[PDB]
Amino acid sequence: MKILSLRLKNLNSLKGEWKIDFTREPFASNGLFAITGPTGAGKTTLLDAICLALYHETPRLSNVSQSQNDLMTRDTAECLAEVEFEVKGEAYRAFWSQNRARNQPDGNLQVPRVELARCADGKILADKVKDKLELTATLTGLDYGRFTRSMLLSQGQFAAFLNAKPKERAELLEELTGTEIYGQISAMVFEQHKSARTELTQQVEDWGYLNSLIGSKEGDKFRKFAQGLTLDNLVHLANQQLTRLHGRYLLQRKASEALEVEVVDTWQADAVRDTRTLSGGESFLVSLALALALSDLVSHKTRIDSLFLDEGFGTLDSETLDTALDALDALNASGKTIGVISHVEAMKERIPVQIKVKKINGLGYSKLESTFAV
Amino acid sequence: MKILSLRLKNLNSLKGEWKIDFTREPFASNGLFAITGPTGAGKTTLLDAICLALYHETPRLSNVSQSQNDLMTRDTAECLAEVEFEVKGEAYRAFWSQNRARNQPDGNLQVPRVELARCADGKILADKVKDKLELTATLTGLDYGRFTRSMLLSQGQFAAFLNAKPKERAELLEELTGTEIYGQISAMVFEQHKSARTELEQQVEDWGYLNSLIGSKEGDKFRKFAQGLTLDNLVHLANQQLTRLHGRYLLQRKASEALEVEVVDTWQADAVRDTRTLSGGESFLVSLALALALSDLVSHKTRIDSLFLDEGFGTLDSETLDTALDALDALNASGKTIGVISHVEAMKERIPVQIKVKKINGLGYSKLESTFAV
Amino acid sequence: MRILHTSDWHLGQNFYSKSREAEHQAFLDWLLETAQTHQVDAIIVAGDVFDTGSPPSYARTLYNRFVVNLQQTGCHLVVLAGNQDSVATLNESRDIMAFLNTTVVASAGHAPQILPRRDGTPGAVLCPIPFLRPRDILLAAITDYYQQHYADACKLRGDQPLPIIATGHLTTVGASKSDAVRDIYIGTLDAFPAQNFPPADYIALGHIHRAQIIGGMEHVRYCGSPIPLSFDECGKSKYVHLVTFSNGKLESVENLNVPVTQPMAVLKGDLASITAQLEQWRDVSQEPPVWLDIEITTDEYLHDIQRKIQALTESLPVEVLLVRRSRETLSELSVEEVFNRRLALEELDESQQQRLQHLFTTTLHTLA
Amino acid sequence: MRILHTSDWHLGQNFYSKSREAEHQAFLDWLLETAQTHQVDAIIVAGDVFDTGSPPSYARTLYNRFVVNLQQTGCHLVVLAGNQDSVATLNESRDIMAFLNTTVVASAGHAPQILPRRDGTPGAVLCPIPFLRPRDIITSQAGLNGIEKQQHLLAAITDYYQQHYADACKLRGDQPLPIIATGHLTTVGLDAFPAQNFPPADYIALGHIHRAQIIGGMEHVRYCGSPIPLSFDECGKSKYVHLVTFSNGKLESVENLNVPVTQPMAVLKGDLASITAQLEQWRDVSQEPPVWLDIEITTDEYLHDIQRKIQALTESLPVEVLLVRRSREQRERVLASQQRETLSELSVEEVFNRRLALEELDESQQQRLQHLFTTTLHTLA
DNA sequence: AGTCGTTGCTGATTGGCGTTGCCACCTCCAG
DNA sequence: CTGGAGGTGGCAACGCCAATCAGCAACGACT
Ligand SMILES: Nc1ncnc2c1ncn2[C@@H]1O[C@H](COP(=O)(O)OP(=O)(O)O)[C@@H](O)[C@H]1O
Ligand SMILES: Nc1ncnc2c1ncn2[C@@H]1O[C@H](COP(=O)(O)OP(=O)(O)O)[C@@H](O)[C@H]1O
Ligand SMILES: [Mg+2]
Ligand SMILES: [Mg+2]
Ligand SMILES: [Mn+2]
C-alpha cells in the first residue's frame, strides 16, 4: 500500500484538476516531503482527497453520497478524486466522482460513480460502492478505521488510538490481526443464553454462568479478554520504536480489564504512571510510536509503506523536534516513505522538497505548483 | 473573575513550593504574558493548578481524590494548590491540598483538605468539597463545565463547543442563561405521559402528543427548541468578535432542530457552508471568537476578566497569527488579561512578559525563576 | 376594642436577586410599636404569611422574633394560611404557638373562638376561616360553609353584646389584581360574589395586594400587603386597618400608613429619556440603594443595552434590578409564548390546540 | 441533681427510603415517661438533633411535640448543635424556646449559664459548647499546609475550651455546683481531639459517636451514643441513655438506661441455603412492625438473579428486605507468560482454558462448561 | 430510436433515546 | 490509618425505533 499517483478535481479550495505523481523527478529519493502553505490553502485537502478516493469518506465529513455533499467546491458542477496504489508489487487504481444535475452549479447531487481497476491490464474489478469497499478492504487489509489509525494521522486525532474506548480498541485489534472468531463466540453465547432465558432448568443456569464469563452482545467481553496478547505484542513493538523516538519513556500494558497502556518514566527510577499524565508533545510521540507499531504488527501479512502526519509537530519544542525528525529520517531510510504537514519554521529548512500550496489574493480559491496542473 | 496569585506545591514536574503573584511589577500592566519553556517542562501544570484549586479537577484527569491522585509528583508525600481570585472587587482564596499517610511516598492517599475564604476579612466560607464547589459556582457564576469553555481553553479542546453534542451545547447555554424551567417542563411532561401510559396498562393520546412535541427525559427536546434564541444572541456577539480575529468569515445559525452554527464565506459571494468544512486554523479562530462571545453573554451579571488558552496558535501561519495577536492585543485594552501557552518563536519574541518554566535535565523535574520560589 | 388587620406579608420572598428581610423587619417592629401605642386588643394576619411552602431560614427567624416580641406587648394574635402558605409549615408549630397567646389555623372546619380583651373579658367571635382548599370542602359550597360557620358562631355568642368577625382568603368581584397575585381556582371558580358573605359585623380578607373597599359596604375590606411586592404598585402607599367595635357593632375603621424604607422607581421611554430620568438620583446619596425597573422602548439587543445601562448607573447611588424592552432574548419571552411558537410549526388545528394549551398550562402550574 | 445524657437523635433521617417517624415518636414518649418517673432536673441533647440542615415537616413536628409535651414535667432541656443539623435552623427557634423551659445553642461564644433545679434553686453550671465549626473559631490565612491548618484548628478549639471553662469557674465562684461540660467531637483518649486537652470539669457529656463508651478510662467523660439503631452495623447492639446524678457539688454516679427496641432489624450472612435456614426462624411469628433485614450472600459464583430469589423466599414471610449485596469483585485479564505466544498460535480451546483457570471453579462444573463451550464451536461448523 | 441522463420505489445498517444495572465519590463515622 | 456503611450520581450495555444509504426499475432531453 504505497501511494503512486494522486489526481483530484475541484475539491475544497483546490479549483480545477490537478495530479501529483510520486515517481517524478521530485520524490525520487522517497524522502520527506512537506506540504506547505498558509492556513486554509488545501494542504489537508490533499490528504482528504486521498482518503476520499480510497474509502468514499473524509476525516472531517462523515459521508459523501447522493446527499449532503459539501466537499465539492462552490460554484462548480463536478468533482472527482483518483489515486494509484501498489499492493504486493502490483498497482491498482481507485476512482470516485460526483456531478451535478445538468452540469449546473446548483441542482440535485447525482449518485456518485466509483470503480476499482488494475493498472496491469485495465480490467474493472468493482463498480458498485459496497462491492468496491469490500474488495478494496480485502485487497489492502485496511478499512477506513485502520487506514486512519496507521497510515493517515489527522490533525488533532493523532491520540485517537490512545484515548479510544476499550471496545473500539479491541475491535480494531481483532480486525487488524485477523482473530475475529472470539467476537462471534461471545455473540453466539449471548444469543444462546437469551434464547434459553426467553423460554421461561439447569442448562439455563449453565448458559448464564458461561455468559457471565465470556458472553456479551457484539462480542465485546471475550474480545477484550483475548486481545491482551495482541496488545502486549503491539506495546512491545511500540516500545522498541519509541526507544529512538523519545528516550525518556517506555510502554507497558496495565493489569486492568480495559485495554490500556502505561508509561514507565526511566528518568524517575522507573516510576510507572498512566498515559493521561503525559504532556502534549509526549503523548504525540507516544501515539506516533503506537501508529508505527500498528504498521509493523501486520508486516508479515500485508505491508504498508506510507505514512502521512497532518499536524501536531507544533506541540514539540525545537530541541525535541530535531530528534523526532532524525528518527523519522532513520525510518524513512527504510522502505517507508513519510510526508509531514507543518507550519513551523524549523521544518522549512530540514525538508528540501515541498508540495507548496498558495492562495490567490483573497479570491477564495487556491492553486499549487503549475508542474502538477493537468 | 481575575486571578491575583497562584501558589502550588509538588504538582507534576514542578517539585517544590512555587508562588506566582500577579499584580506585581512585571504583571502590573495587565498586559500579555506567555508561559514559555521546553516540552514536558510543566507549562500546562501552571494552568492545571488554577483549575485544581478552584474546581477540584484538572482538564487531563477527570477526578483527584483518595482513590486516585496522578497529579502529585513522584517520590513526594504531599501536594497543594491555592489561588487568589477577585469577583466584583472582593478577593477570595481557594485551597486544595492532599497528604500521603505517614508522610511516606508509598503510603495511602488521605482525604483532601479544601477551604474557601475571603482574603481581607479572613472568614472561612466553606470547608467541604460539595459546599465549596456549589458556593464557588454561585459566586463566580461559572462552575468547571463553564470555566473550561469560556475562561480556560485547554490543549486540543478549543473546538469542544462546536464539536459537542447538541444536548451538551444546550445544557451549557441553559447554565449560562439560567433558563432550566423549559427542561423541567419537558421532563415532567415526559414523566406524566409515562405515568398515564402505565395507568392505561382519551388522556393517553394527548399526553403522547405533547410528549412527541416537547416531552423528553431530562428535557432534551424542549431545551434544544428553546435555546435557539440564546444561540442567535450568542452568534451576534460571535460575529462581532470574529470580525476582528478573522475578517473572511461570519457565523449564522443552522435551520435545524439540532442547534448548530453554519458559516458564511464573504469571499465566496456569501456562500454559506457547514462548520465542519473549516480549516484547522479557521476552526481555532472561530472557536476562540465563540468562546469570547460566550464569556461576553453574561457580562452584565458576572463579568470574566481573564482568558487562558493552550498552544492553539500552532495551527496558524505567520500572517493569520499576527492578525489574531493584534486582535488579542486590542481586546487587552478592555482589561481582560490574556495568558498564552506556545512555542512559536514569532509570538514568543512579540510578547515581552514571560514566565520561563526552566527544565532540569536527567532528574525530570523543573523550576521557575528564583523570584517565584518560596 | 381595637384590632389591626393586615395580610399578604409574603415573608421570605426573593425579589429577583434581592431579599426583603430588612423591609420586613422594619415593618414588624413598627407594627409592634403602633400596636403598643394604640393598645390594640388583637392582631390578625389573614393569609400569605410565607411566600412559599418551604420558607428560608431568615423568614422563620423573623416570624419567631415577631411572635416573641408580641409577648412584651400583650396582644392576642391570629395566623391564617393563604394560597401560597402551606399546611405542615404553619400547622406544624401550632401547639407551641398556643402558649404564646397566638392561634394558628390552616385547616378548615375549626370551631369559632372567643377573642379576649386586654383585661381578659370576651371581646368578639373570630370565625377563623383560612384559604379554603376545594379538596377540603363550589360557589355555593363557599357560601353555605360561611353561612353555617357564622350560624355556629351565632349560636355560640347567644345574646351577648359582642361583635362577630369573619375571615377569608379569596378573590371577589370588583377587585383589582396585580402581577404578583397568584390566581386560585383556575378551573372551577372565577370570582366570589361579595353579597354572599354572612352578615358578620366585620370581614377581614387578603389575597389582593391593593387596599380596596369591596361591594360598597364598609364592613368588608381588603387590607393588602404592607410592603410593595411588585413593580406595578411601588408608588401606592400601603395600609393597615385599625378597626374599632363598641356595643356589639362597628364603630370606625382607620388607615395607617406604613413608612416606606426601600425606595423603588420605574423608568420609561427611550434611552434618551432614561438618560434624563436617571438624573433624579445624581449626587443625592440615598443610603438605601433604590430598586429600578427600566422599561426601555428600543429594538436593540438586551444583552448589549444592559451594558450601557450599567455604565450610566455606575456613577449613581442606584441599583437596577430589571430591564425589559417595551432581537428578542430568551430571558424576555413568556413560557406560554415560547410553547405556542412550537405549536405554530405543528398543525394549527384548534380542536387539539385548546387541549394542548390547557395541558401545558396545568403542567407549568404543577411546576409552580 | 439528676440529668439525662442523650445525642444523635437524627430526626427526619431516611433509612433506605424508610422513615423513622414512629420509632422516634415512641422513643420520645418513653423518654418523657422516664424523666417523669426519675424526677429529672434537665435533659442534654449533644448535637445531631436533625439528620440534615433542612429537616422535613414531620421531623419539625416531632421536635415541637416533644418540646411542648415536656412542659408538663417542668424539667429543663438543653439542645446543642451537631455536625449534622444547621446553626440557622436551630437558631430559628432560640427565642421562642426560651419561653418554654428550653435552651438551644448552635453558635460559639454562648456564655455559661446556671441550670435550675425543679424547685428553681441553682443546681449546676451548664457551660454549653456546641459543635465548633471551623468558620466560627479560626480565621484562614495564606501560606499554610493541610496539616498546619488542622494543628491551628486543634490549638484554637483547645484554647476555646480552656477559656470557656475558666469563665464558667468564675461564674460558679464559691457555691458547690458541678460544672457540667458538653461537646460534639471525636476523642481517642492526627485530626481527632485528645481527651487530655479537656478542662477538669465535673462532667463532660460528649457527642458524635453512636456507641456508648468511656474515654480514657475517665468515667466523667462519656459518649452517650444514639438512642436508636441508625444502621445495620449496630442493629443487634442495645442502646443506652445515661442518667447522671450529682451530690454536694461533685459527680456521684452514672446509670445506663436501655431504650426499648421499636423496629427490629437483623443481618444475615452465607449462601442462599444459609439465608433460607436463617429465615426459617421467622416462619410463624406475629411481627409488628415487620423486621428489616440486610442480606450478605457469600459468593461461590452462583451469578443468579438473586433479587427474584430473595423476593420469592421472603414473600410468604412477615419480612421486608431493605438491602442485599455480594462480594463479586475480581479482575479478568490474560497474563502473557512469554512474548513468543501470539493470539494466532493459541487455539480457541486453549484461550478458553486460560480463561477458566483464572476462576477457582472445580471439575463438578468444568466438564459441563467445556462441553457447552464446544457446542458453540460445533454449531458454527 | 437510441442512448444517455435524471427521477421515483424497497431492504440493510446505524445512530439516538430510554432502561436497568453497576461502580465510583463524598460524608460520617467505628475497628 | 483504615475501613465501611449509606446516599447520590455517572457510565455502560442492551432493547427498540426512526432516518438514511445503496440497489433497482421507470420517464425526459439531446443527438
Ligand atoms: N465546499 C467548499 N467549497 C470551497 N471551499 C471550501 C469548501 N469546504 C471547505 N473549503 C475551504 O477549503 C480550505 C481547505 O483548507 P485546509 O486544507 O483545511 O487547510 P489547512 O491545511 O491549513 O488545515 C478552507 O479554506 C475551507 O474553508
Ligand atoms: N505524577 C507525576 N509525577 C511527575 N511528573 C509527572 C507526573 N505527571 C506528569 N508528570 C510530568 O510533568 C510534565 C508536565 O508537563 P506539561 O505541563 O504537560 O507540559 P506542556 O506545557 O509542554 O504541555 C510532563 O513531563 C509529565 O509527564
Ligand atoms: Mg489542516
Ligand atoms: Mg500541554
Ligand atoms: Mn394570596
Ligand SMILES: [Mn+2]
Ligand atoms: Mn397575597
